[PDB]
Amino acid sequence: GSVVGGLGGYMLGSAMSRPMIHFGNDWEDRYYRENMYRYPNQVYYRPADQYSNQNNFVHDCVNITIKQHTVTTTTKGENFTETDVKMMERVVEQMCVTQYQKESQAYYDGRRSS
């Protein structure tokens, strides 16, 4: 994990696979697809040590990955409008839903792959 310091004790995991959300729409599907690269392929999250349920973590990891991008524009330009944010609310979602599970299989066992 490339655990960024500019976080309130959250981490940074690994690169993922930018999903294929269609939003149940034709235009959202397309607009996302045409721009899917602009969004991160990663997420930020606190450790599952203080969690239990998908909602709690996913809700945080939404707000966090979104804002950390929508705030990183204060040193970049990634300002992400409401339409971009709604894409992110699903993109960082699927990433975080996975990201949870990845660590849930490394917090439950004591991390002993030996």
Q: How far is CA 46 from CA 10, 32, 79, 101, in A?
A: 4, 27, 23, 13
Report yes or no: 18 and 92 within 8 Å, Cβ to Cβ: no
Q: How was this one solved?
A: NMR
Query: 8: Cβ–Cβ under 8 A, 6 or more apart, which residues?
Result: 46
In the block, tokens 């330009």 appear at 77
Domain ranges of the chain: 1-114
Please give, one letter per residue, the 3-state secondary structure of the chain.
CCCCCCCCCCEECCCCCCCCCCCCCHHHHHHHHHHCCCCCCCCEECCHHHCCCHHHHHHHHHHHHHHHHHHHCCCCCCCCCHHHHHHHHHHHHHHHHHHHHHHHCCCCCCCCCC
d(CA 114, CA 98): 23
| 8 A C-beta contact, residue 1 and residue 14 | yes
Fold held by 1-114:
Major Prion Protein (1.10.790)
